[PDB]
Design a protein around this ligand. Sequence first.
Ligand SMILES: Nc1ncnc2c1ncn2[C@@H]1O[C@H](COP(=O)(O)OP(=O)(O)NP(=O)(O)O)[C@@H](O)[C@H]1O
Ligand SMILES: O=C(CNC(=O)c1cccnc1C(=O)O)Nc1ccc(F)c(Cl)c1
Ligand SMILES: [Mn+2]
Ligand SMILES: [Mn+2]
Ligand SMILES: [Zn+2]
Length: 354
Amino acid sequence: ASKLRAVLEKLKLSRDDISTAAGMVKGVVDHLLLRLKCDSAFRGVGLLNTGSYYEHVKISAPNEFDVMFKLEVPRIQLEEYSNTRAYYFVKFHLSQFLEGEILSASKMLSKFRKIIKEEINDIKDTDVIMKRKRGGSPAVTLLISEKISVDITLALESKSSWPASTQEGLRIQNWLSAKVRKQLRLKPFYLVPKHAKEGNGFQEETWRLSFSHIEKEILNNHGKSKTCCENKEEKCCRKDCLKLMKYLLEQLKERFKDEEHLDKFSSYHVKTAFFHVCTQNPQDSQWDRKDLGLCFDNCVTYFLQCLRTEKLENYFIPEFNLFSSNLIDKRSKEFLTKQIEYERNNEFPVFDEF
Ligand SMILES: Nc1ncnc2c1ncn2[C@@H]1O[C@H](COP(=O)(O)OP(=O)(O)NP(=O)(O)O)[C@@H](O)[C@H]1O
Ligand SMILES: O=C(CNC(=O)c1cccnc1C(=O)O)Nc1ccc(F)c(Cl)c1
Ligand SMILES: [Mn+2]
Ligand SMILES: [Mn+2]
Ligand SMILES: [Zn+2]
């Protein structure tokens, strides 16, 4: 009926596209998993599916999938890197990766990337290529059949207690319950080969904490009520609001692709801000389908406040500020503030098709 509901209709994924893309991705991922198990270093890899497709908040087309290839490293000892809260040294067939007693993130990622590159070349039945290494990413990115991108992130799995920098994160007690928080923090955590900033460069030995699996569990079990979105009387608009925030940023980045001020914004910024708004608004009655426009406004104004105050804490690691001036210039946040305010004040013309 409404403008926003019409936008959501256009953002829905086609069942046929899903069927084709799911089969294509599974074939390639399962192949690489099998072949990586042949290498002595990656003998123990397992699959975890992550990101927006597996949280059912992928929009427009199923053409971008995220997966972790995780390895359990028992007796893992961590050392936080230079008070960064999110980046760590890992102290420790893995010997090829040691730089001292440090298990080098870049060394492992390099070898991981090299094995995958050699293995996709032998896939003659399918058209699979490696995309160029994108700086700062822990992923190795594939393109299947010129159309579907798959980001494969190497991860070390730890079944130890989560690091102390997470003690005050995951503030879900009033929304999803204290007992759920306790259950989630008994799950493993992951380290991925995303390196801390060091000057104008990177500390290439360091790893980054990742809780992508907890983000998926929260998105796929997202209500105060256990039956949220399982029946026609409890269809909340939380996922719709995240889809609309993602589309707002996707559209602005496309329009402003030649404007440097939008380069460092990402869908993870809107995902993080969305989790915070869920913490702020914990009741399912604050996400009623009939209030879609108000709920989406709640999300837009929260994100605008994050930009203006330069505060967007990582949801798991509260002293890691994604909107720190060390990461994004004030001028760039003000620029995005300007464009989002324009959309809010004009009923989101960037959502119009014509
Ligand atoms: N900067 C980051 N910090 C922590 N985790 C991240 C970061 N970027 C990506 N991730 C994780 O990796 C997943 C996949 O990344 P990405 O493909 O960029 O996002 P997405 O959520 O799948 N959104 P999209 O692909 O645009 O629909 C995210 O959902 C996060 O769980
Ligand atoms: O840091 C990054 C940079 N982002 C990307 O490379 C990107 C860009 C466009 C689409 N997708 C992606 C992707 O990452 O999937 N990603 C990241 C991934 C897993 C993690 F556990 C952590 Cl901590 C960070
Ligand atoms: Mn994705
Ligand atoms: Mn991705
Ligand atoms: Zn719901």
